[PDB]
Amino acid sequence: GSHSMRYFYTSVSRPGRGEPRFIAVGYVDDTQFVRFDSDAASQRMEPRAPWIEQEGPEYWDRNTRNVKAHSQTDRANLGTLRGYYNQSEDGSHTIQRMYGCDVGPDGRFLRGYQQDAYDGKDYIALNEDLRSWTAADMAAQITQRKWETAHEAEQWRAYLEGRCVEWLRRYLENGKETLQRTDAPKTHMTHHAVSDHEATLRCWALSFYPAEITLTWQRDGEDQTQDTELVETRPAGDGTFQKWASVVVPSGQEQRYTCHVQHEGLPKPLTLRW
């Protein structure tokens, strides 16, 4: 189908505690493949998926240099923003940055992304035309004018339409056996009695990839949300994902309820019934 590459950067100032901590992680679809930690001993970008290890030493030198440079700039930017917002030297603050690109199933560029947040709220983001910015407030407007003057959108557009998608395509080829797989959910249902009057049905999806899935309960063929519980999709730790959905039903009416499972790895959606 379509695929994506994303980098996620987090810088946190640690006032009194020393110098800011920087963490970078890279993903293709729902699979992490690199990390960099400003606190770790290696001071290198590190592999976190098997297929990225077939990149040679120049790749690791270059990605280490560039991600270190990004970390240094975000260190600068923590001091800059505390000035812009008239904040004290005392509190801890957070810069988050996400960027990346999507490709379609034939590998062609679909869209590119760059967005930054300060203390959890939108700060500045590149617009979809990859030529202009959306600034969230007056402080971000200061940054906007510096970046429009420096033609920074040209650099971002060049990367997002060029190197980003070219390397994303390369990863999908190098990691075809895992990135281009679909693992269909392994499903089952559990049944536990609350009282004489009610029971819980819990509909499970396990060992699936990618993470996108839909679990819905119906009663007599009608969608049901009352007295249901859906948990957030969660990692199993082995590269696959898990989810469940439960419903509280009157005892002896279990046959009226169906759980419906939709996932890319299923030719047709599944219906489970107790």
């Binding site: 560039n66 700039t73 930017n77 510096k146």
Partner: peptide, 12 residues
């Protein structure tokens, strides 16, 4: 592959 910036890119 991370963004390849100018030395002075992305300064707030």
């Amino acid at each position: 592959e991370v963004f390849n910036a100018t030395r002075f890119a992305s300064v707030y």
